[PDB]
Write a protein that binds this ligand. Structure first.
Ligand SMILES: CC(C)(COP(=O)(O)OP(=O)(O)OC[C@H]1O[C@@H](n2cnc3c(N)ncnc32)[C@H](O)[C@@H]1OP(=O)(O)O)[C@@H](O)C(=O)NCCC(=O)NCCS
Ligand SMILES: CC(C)(COP(=O)(O)OP(=O)(O)OC[C@H]1O[C@@H](n2cnc3c(N)ncnc32)[C@H](O)[C@@H]1OP(=O)(O)O)[C@@H](O)C(=O)NCCC(=O)NCCS
Lengths: 390, 390, 390, 390
């Protein structure tokens, strides 16, 4: 079976408590489902299932993926579900959507992810009561998204572990971070995020605001400001707020169908999904997940690293992005050519389809034939997907 | 590709704030993962992926499926993820496990579900702040588990909608509820849940407690006690706490591999997965989901309704179970022969795998050749799976 | 036994979440305690007891009055206690101080009120647990400070009740609220609050900040911004944000001792306490209570209403404040000459000391032989006290 | 002047989350207010003011003393307020009431205290919002009731400090504790608490329960079970749950009037208040407070210690109780003859009116002439009162 990505879209990525501060993830997801449909010339009546990665759905109500689908006019007879493989989610959803089509269970899938880190609630288990003494209201964003479940420390600490093992200086991490900002700024000013972004209308009271630019990108980002930051996780460390990605909101998706179906419809697809892989690694160095996952995906495609024309490798932290690049040895000039998540941001459950969006539109723009998208995953995993142009 | 269920297990289903009141879902999952492995003679080192349905993960930390896998000794090099299609989740995870094998991405999967409704927290979005006045702490079990996201009302009200469309008296619903209790009691007393149940040790300061019986089942349940209850959702209604399922905790899973892989290993499998389906319906009558799902599953198998030897159709509410039975027209004497959820309970994300467990072990013990498991799903969906013995 | 207020001091009154947003009451209380000691030339070790009114103590630790006293340098030998007569609490504390001395139980007392409405938390009783469903986190500032415990409604609704019985038009309340603004803007600029205020140092991190101005007074207040406000409590109402007092922070106190003592210490006092009283009235019309309270205080003094040259009468609302003026019949050109609580603020537990400070320093200023300070109290009470300058 | 206690009553003392687990303090207070009215044969319309000690009022609404008063049928024309001197409050309100009569401000007062430690909430300051992170829900029972504001540790730590100074072995403390339990079992079983207890009806959904017995008293308390307990604060220390009082709920009151009034009305009072005293000490050793307070009270009464026929001295902890006794040298056999707070419980704001009740009725039944009630006070204070039978 040959599955293509007929169309794709993403919202702009919102800053923490920024543009999307009070927008539920399923509203972002609904806009992105409408857009992939419009972009492909496929009607919502035609969709069989919607599959959305999402890590932080607490308080949002029954299966936000169904909410997003219904809001986008996807008929009640279709189905929808959410899934959670942490930062891998929005990419793994695409692979799962491909499998629906490959096994003959569906013809048309919309797959990606959505996340509102801003709207994630604080919680406490209160059923058994608290007979005496203080208790914590727990931030679900930190607890369920950002804290290792085995070791009890933030993802930032796994990044420090990688910095130590790979001997990555503060200087090198900072330079990588400044480069991410500067590349993202240039791509933004040149209009290279236009094709991928679908504008999102934030409704208010005193006026609707259209959001169509990635607001987390820092323009004119200096090495000096990066260098002046204090280590954010270890007092004698190297990982800072500047060389780590952010807390962000957004959604991203792809519309999938068979290659034979896109041909019937006269759709020029954004690419054929040639392989995907997911592999585990030690939780303590979770940032290394893209290494075995990329290698396995490439093996499954029958491709050498040198065959790749473009790469999107998620920048959760400069320390891990640098480790991945060192080990794989791919030309860094083809990696995150338009910036990465240090600059763009990291809306967890949407990230994987966010970078897939960026890869597919840049692949189209430059005429690149073979690309790969890859993410590290909390708790020690990687996910990778190989895309070829038709 | 022919995928078999090599082994299966579930915990006892705990009562709300009962035996598992302070046991995290992933601990229940870890025991069920260890058990399917032990029962199949497969080592944890051999597992490629763990896929666990779970609707209420809030506060449990990063990717509870990975937590369960790790605690069960599944290697760091395997992967694990969570998914949510509400009541359908634990069955859908099984079909998703099947698909990983079918597409050559994995050889051995443990799939199912887990849920701790008891441990589900209360929450409030507090990031903007609360400058002045009262705010609501929201019960995530109700909000995210049991309330329709479109109409704002409980799943119970959708049961009333179905009661009214199908003209299902209070007396009919209560008789069905009493029967489910009395069937479950008889199965329990005769030992028919022993094979499917893996005991769970609840670790305690003042002593360990082994839980190996379904504690929600009411022994000696009378019609009069059903008849005395007030409607729980509408005041001229008919759906009560007695003729609905409960709020419950448990986990349930299946170990999957190819039919050829089971042969090599000398495993006598519990069943071959012959087909599965998921379809949507109107959220207002979500309890009718099993009707289209089961019919589509049967069509994919090439079976008639009359070919089934055993059926597990989930009893979210008497009202909907009755409607499903009436429309399908299957012999009621082959449906839920050991009782159903009204008696056994309804640990949401686990339910689909719990009923699968019950199906497979009853199929083995009676020598039934063809079986079907189906559930209704909040927000208007159904899932069904057809199993043949080999 | 004749008792005299040897000295007095008060913080400026802050607005809600403003100057004292993160400053505990007891710290504001300590500044005041020290201020009065210094002002009279009395050593802290000479004080027998600190009596501080305070309505909103939750979270602040054991006996915040004791905390005030110790942080002010009052040694461990002295005693301290808080009390609560809601709005009259800070005047009643002065009466109680007076009482200790005239019973021979003490020689020297510091008495006033303190309040941090800003630091008042949300709370819920959670020892029993909350087995299922949403619950409310309660704003203690509102539940314990501004909600009638009998009927269940806010104090501005008792102001609506007094507006209907005393036939006060919406235009007449705006007239009184601008006139108080004008009068307090006048005072502030004219330097009349300098003496009574003791500066408070809000220890920041990037900067300490000397608060010495009443920052709830609105400069250049007209009838227009007043008469374009929506009724805050009824929909067809006449009470508003601008003709009611504010939510505020602050502390206030007096240094008490016997007449003969003050003469021994070479202290020229601010005034002698000749009488005081508290009376109850209907909780529905709680703003009525300064009428019977002021008559009783006045009769205990052996005075007449026309004998008064200066009067502080607390403006919780402009309907209740206009009502006391109209019934008692005193000349309103001697009533709150430096403005009122609508302008200055309503720091509950401190209010009565506050208005005591203004009366005492203003009396001292102009040469007024006889004072009266009086306050209405939620729950249907009044408090009053008659002062003679020596 | 000469004030007498015309009558007195108290509820039973409830166990933490026991009989009064869901009964508000003012409800207990209301029942004790109605009791002292009834027992004195004085009508509620005659009461000038109600003064109740209360330490943990968060979330009970406006001034819970006015709530106990209005529910007791005290008319709206009276006044009511609460006060807080921690464990002293309940006895201190009595001296406060006596002061109101001595200074001609009232003829008739009801005074004592109330407390529901069970119903004390958890709280957090949430006004600015919590942008990121866990935050604490603070148990006001512990924060505001049981934790020293200066040193930040429990009252039972102050009890360790006292035990160290006085060289009071683990055995000595337990011997005092078991005696106190055994004294109270005896008083309970012989009906010595019947007079002072007024029954309280807990209104409920499935039945009214009448509570008229102290439920905290341990029957059959032995030295050997006392000895089996672990230290509750210091891990090489001596203060245990067995030799410290507990967390309890209750209310207690006395009705005060001049000796001449009581003669007018033919009332036989329960005692003439002869003196009272409060003093401060080091908070580190707050349990020594009763020493200067009782010695100063006795100096004010003109009495020697050996003139006392009966003493109630509060047992917040066996360590401080033993210390107090050793210093004062009074015959232990007249101290807490019906047992003490270790047995009976320690409902904070009510403790002092509680032991005042206990002393009064025992003074009446054995024909004792002279009596003293004293308590230690967190933050380092003592309070005492001398009582002569008429
Ligand atoms: C690191 C983290 C705690 C910082 O979050 P934050 O509180 O919203 O950021 P802060 O406002 O505190 O940042 C501190 C400073 O760094 C600055 N900063 C960030 N990037 C910068 C850059 N490129 N140059 C200069 N300054 C920068 C901010 O402007 C801020 O300045 P200020 O405190 O003087 O106002 C948070 O973003 C985080 O958790 N990141 C990791 C996300 C993650 O783990 N994702 C998944 C991992 S697999
Ligand atoms: C119906 C529901 C709201 C009731 O809430 P609940 O608090 O758990 O109700 P309880 O189990 O305590 O039952 C109430 C009373 O009836 C009794 N009772 C419960 N089940 C009974 C039965 N089957 N027969 C007779 N009596 C019964 C209990 O003993 C209890 O006693 P009480 O009179 O002293 O209160 C809740 O169970 C529910 O939501 N059920 C459906 C869950 C659901 O929707 N799942 C997924 C939907 S697709």
């Amino acid at each position: 079976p040959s599955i293509v990505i007929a169309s794709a879209a993403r919202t702009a990525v919102g800053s923490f408590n920024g543009a999307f501060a009070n927008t539920p993830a399923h509203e972002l997801g609904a806009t992105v489902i409408s857009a992939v449909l419009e972009r492909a010339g496929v009607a919502a009546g035609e969709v069989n299932e919607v599959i959305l990665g999402q890590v932080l759905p607490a308080g949002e109500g029954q299966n936000p993926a169904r909410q997003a689908a219904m809001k986008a006019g996807v008929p009640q007879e279709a189905t929808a579900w959410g899934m959670n493989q942490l930062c891998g989610s929005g990419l793994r959803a695409v692979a799962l959507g491909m499998q629906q089509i490959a096994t003959g269970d569906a013809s048309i899938i919309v797959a990606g992810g959505m996340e509102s880190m801003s709207m994630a609630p604080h919680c406490a288990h209160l059923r058994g009561g608290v007979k005496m003494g203080d208790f914590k209201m727990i931030d679900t964003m930190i607890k369920d998204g950002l804290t290792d479940a085995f070791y009890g420390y933030h993802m930032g600490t796994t990044a420090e572990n990688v910095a130590k093992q790979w001997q990555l200086s503060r200087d090198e991490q900072d330079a990588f971070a400044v480069a991410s900002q500067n590349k993202a700024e240039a791509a933004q000013k040149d209009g290279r995020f236009k094709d991928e972004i679908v504008p999102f209308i934030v409704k208010g009271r005193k006026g609707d605001i259209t959001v169509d630019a990635d607001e987390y990108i820092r323009h004119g980002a200096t090495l000096d400001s990066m260098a002046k930051l204090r280590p954010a996780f270890d007092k004698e460390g190297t990982v800072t707020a500047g060389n780590a990605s952010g807390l962000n909101d957004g959604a991203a998706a792809a519309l999938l169908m068979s290659e034979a179906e896109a041909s019937r419809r006269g759709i020029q697809p954004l690419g054929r999904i040639v392989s995907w892989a997911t592999v585990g690694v030690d939780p303590k160095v979770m940032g290394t997940g893209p290494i075995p996952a990329s290698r396995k995906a490439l093996e499954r495609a029958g491709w050498k690293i040198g065959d790749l024309d473009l790469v999107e490798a998620n920048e959760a932290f400069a320390a891990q992005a640098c480790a991945v690049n060192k080990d794989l040895g791919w030309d860094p000039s083809i990696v995150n050519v338009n910036g990465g998540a240090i600059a763009i941001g990291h809306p967890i459950g949407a990230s994987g389809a966010r970078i897939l969006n960026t890869l597919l539109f840049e692949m189209k723009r430059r005429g690149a034939r073979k690309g790969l998208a890859t993410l590290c995953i909390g708790g020690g995993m990687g996910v990778a997907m190989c895309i070829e142009s038709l």
